Design a protein around this ligand. Structure first.
Ligand SMILES: [Mg+2]
Lengths: 234, 252, 57, 117
RNA sequence: GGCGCCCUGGAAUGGGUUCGCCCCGAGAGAGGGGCCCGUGCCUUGGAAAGCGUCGCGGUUCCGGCGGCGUCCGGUGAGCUCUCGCUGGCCCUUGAAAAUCCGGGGGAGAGGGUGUAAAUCUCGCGCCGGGCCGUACCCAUAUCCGCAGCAGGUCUCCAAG
RNA sequence: CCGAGGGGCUCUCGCUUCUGGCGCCAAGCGCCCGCCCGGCCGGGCGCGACCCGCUCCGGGGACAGUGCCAGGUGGGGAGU
């Protein structure tokens, strides 16, 4: 108000020093960064086989949440409760000496070498299989294996999220074998939303190649010829 | 059985260049936002001299666009420039003497020194004292321009190659006789260890393919093939013709 | 004098009481004073001759 | 978030102060060069004797690992006298000769007579 | 001694100048200033010491005691060294860094007054400066050549 | 393109060029906190400094290059 003069800075070429802008594109990253990004781009640029493109088509977040809820109360036995289940086992042998206390303790089996034995004996109900397993060959057979054995399978986003069901880091596969009688319709509820997408669509998920798309700076100049080639006809 | 003289120039023990009192590489400033889109102003501070070069240099202080700093370039001095002259460098720079601007924007038949053979290579072609290149033939579709090198050989280069307008200073230098053996000695003491060239006919059969004999004669034909090995390529290497030249050159 | 003895003087034996004191030569200062002022004023002139150019077209 | 420089430089991570859970040598070694081992002899030659009365100094032979700060405290603490300045000399048969000039309070002569010579 | 430093003022009938040049309306000559080097002289040091000479003590430390002296001028294509000023020769342009300093900016900081702050490249005062080399020969006898070998082996000072 | 107050087959870029000067570490505006009883201090964020996006930007490119074999040539070199 008294003086308080406005003094703008012209930022054109040949004027004041350019201000500190973003520069997060034009920054020389370490070579572990640009290895990590260029191989991500190059799973989009190459013709990906349909067995690797069995993945990248996962359950949406509503269906994964209805699934991980049901897999949460069938959580495996942590070592804390393993300590006290064996205390409560001996104190009932010190009490009653029963022949059979539990008919079947229901739980989800986890691990690919555990799951694959259950799929090929047809003892599994629903096989949740992970997404970003670091060599794919550990996992790539098992969508084709569940289809022949008749087990319904589904791909969930993230190997580390279902690895938190099992109190570990990643676990790559979980599978329901036995559920409870009050959840038998709950496991059957999601089981036709799943095999509609994966098992019934085996002939489509096997035809379906992936990748093969070009980057944005080259798909925006092929399109510029297509605008001129449409400008030619009219 | 002994190696020959030109074979010993590749190891680079005493045949390395004499580079102590030289000043730096004489290069155009690197291209960034200012020259791709506009121009930038710089003032030449002094005209200096390289030892072992025939051209002089021009040190030019520019204003850094991104940091508050004045930073000095070294240009090949185009002929006619003086100290305290404004030098403009960009795409939208105006075609005057000493201004450096891309070859695709400047017209056909302008005289060009110190030009880039691939874009952003900071000046490679037409740099010796008194030499220049001429541009013709802009192709604005598939942007390529052809220039005419100091050897009379034309070359189609990229359009965004950058180039200072004018001729290199210090021209007419080879018109003067060296005129005595002493001033050739000081000429190459700035350059290399190369000057007193013994004829291979004068040396011995260990030392050259041409030496030996009771008479100084070559004996064998002095035009040799190009796929001759090292130690045998001496004389007229893969010569298309010999004898005193007639016509102009008549071979493209 | 030598460079390391300049750490022993006081700064009256080392500069002159002008602006640009012991760095420039008292007439290039004078030239820099006139060269600075007289082209900031033409930037007033090119501002007003562009002001009365676009406004009557 | 922004990155106002085009360079990725590595972040300042944390560096713990090294606190072990056993010492590696179990005890400090005692110094083999103490103030008794600084000083070997008093030099007792004719050129070292006229340097006592005429110069207020007195000449020693010292271990060659000592410097003039250590000799200044070894002479001071063994002989209960002040030291003005010290000069040293590797004499060419291998050993370090010290020229300890005493303070003007003290006399080089009676100190010489009570140290033995 | 030097100045490509300033102010006044304006030059032709051109003048000022050098051994040579060179300089001038982008300011000559003339007048008055300013700065840099001052390794010269004067002064403090500093005459108390040094030397010359004449004595006198002290056997021995004696850095004895004393008298008088250590004074005027000139000169130069002189030799040697240094400082400077101007030229010439180059298709030859005749080093880097450590250190050190000025300048520009003005983010800050300061006592807030009938008293003193932050600061100080000013004048004095206090403390410290470790390590290693240090003799001598350096050559028709201390080096190398088998030797005290007409050989070899880098420099400075130099009178009539 | 037509024509009424304007419409966008087709379009343009921008803010530095008489001179041996200077140019950074934000002004301003809008919001928000502790601080003032409908007012005062010290901080915060945004706009100034547009948005999205998968190669840093250009130049080549399935060639060059390299690994291997086959054929030329090879006193440059080795053996006799
Ligand atoms: Mg010859």
């Amino acid at each position: 108000n008294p003086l308080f003069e406005k003094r703008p800075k012209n930022f054109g070429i040949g004027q004041d020093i350019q201000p500190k802008r973003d520069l997060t594109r034009f920054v020389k990253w370490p070579r572990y960064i640009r290895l990590q990004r260029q191989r991500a781009i190059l799973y989009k640029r190459l013709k990906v086989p349909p067995a690797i493109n069995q993945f990248t088509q996962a359950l949406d977040r509503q269906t994964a949440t209805q699934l991980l809820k049901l897999a949460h109360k069938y959580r495996p036995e942590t070592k804390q409760e393993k300590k006290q289940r064996l205390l409560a086992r001996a104190e009932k042998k010190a009490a009653g000496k029963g022949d059979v206390p539990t008919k079947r303790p229901p739980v989800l089996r986890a691990g690919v070498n555990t799951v694959t034995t259950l799929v090929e004996n047809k003892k599994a109900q629903l096989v949740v299989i992970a997404h970003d397993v670091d060599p794919i060959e550990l996992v790539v057979f098992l969508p084709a294996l569940c289809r022949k054995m008749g087990v319904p399978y589904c791909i969930i986003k993230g190997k580390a999220r279902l690895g938190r069901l099992v109190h570990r880091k990643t676990c790559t596969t979980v599978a329901f074998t036995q559920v409870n009688s009050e959840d038998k319709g709950a496991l059957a509820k999601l089981v036709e939303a799943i095999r509609t997408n994966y098992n019934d669509r085996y002939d489509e998920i096997r035809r379906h190649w992936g990748g093969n798309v070009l980057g944005p700076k080259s798909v925006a100049r092929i399109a510029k010829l297509e605008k001129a080639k449409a400008k030619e006809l009219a | 059985g002994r190696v020959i003289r030109g074979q010993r120039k590749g190891a680079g023990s005493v045949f390395r260049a004499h580079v102590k009192h030289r000043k730096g590489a004489a290069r155009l400033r690197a291209v960034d936002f200012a020259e791709r889109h506009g121009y930038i102003k710089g003032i030449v501070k002094d005209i200096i001299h390289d030892p072992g070069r025939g051209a002089p240099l021009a040190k030019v202080v520019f204003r850094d666009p991104y940091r508050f700093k004045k930073r000095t370039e070294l240009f090949i001095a185009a002929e006619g420039i003086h100290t305290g002259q404004f030098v403009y460098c960009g795409k939208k720079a105006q075609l005057n003497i000493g201004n450096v601007l891309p070859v695709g924007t400047m017209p056909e038949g302008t005289i060009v020194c110190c030009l880039e053979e691939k874009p952003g290579d900071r000046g490679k072609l037409a740099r010796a004292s008194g030499n220049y290149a001429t541009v013709i033939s802009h192709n604005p579709e598939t942007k390529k321009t052809r220039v005419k090198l100091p050897s009379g050989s034309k070359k189609v280069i990229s359009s965004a190659n950058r180039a200072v307008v004018g001729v290199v200073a210090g021209g007419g230098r080879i018109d003067k006789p060296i005129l005595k053996a002493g001033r050739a000695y000081h000429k190459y003491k700035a350059k290399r260890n190369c000057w007193p060239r013994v004829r291979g006919v004068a040396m011995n059969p260990v030392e050259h393919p041409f030496g030996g004999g009771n008479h100084q004669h070559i004996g064998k034909p002095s035009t040799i093939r190009r796929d001759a090995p090292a130690g045998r390529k001496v004389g007229l290497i893969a010569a298309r013709r010999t004898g005193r030249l007639r016509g102009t050159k008549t071979v493209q | 004098v030598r460079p390391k003895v300049l750490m022993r003087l006081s700064k009256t034996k080392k500069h002159v009481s002008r602006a640009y004191g012991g760095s420039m030569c008292a007439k290039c200062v004078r030239d820099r004073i006139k060269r600075a002022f007289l082209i900031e004023e033409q930037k007033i002139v090119v501002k007003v001759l562009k002001a009365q150019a676009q406004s009557q077209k | 978030k922004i990155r106002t420089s085009p360079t990725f430089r590595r972040p300042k991570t944390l560096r713990l102060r090294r606190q072990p859970k056993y010492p590696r040598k179990s005890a400090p070694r005692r110094n083999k060069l103490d103030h008794y081992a600084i000083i070997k002899f008093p030099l007792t030659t004719e050129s070292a004797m006229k340097k006592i009365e005429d110069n207020n100094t007195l000449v020693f032979i010292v271990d060659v690992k000592a410097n003039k700060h250590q000799i200044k405290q070894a002479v001071k603490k063994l002989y209960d006298i002040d030291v003005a300045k010290v000069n040293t000399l590797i004499r060419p048969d291998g050993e370090k000769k010290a020229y300890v000039r005493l303070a003007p309070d003290y006399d080089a002569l009676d100190v010489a007579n009570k140290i033995g010579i």
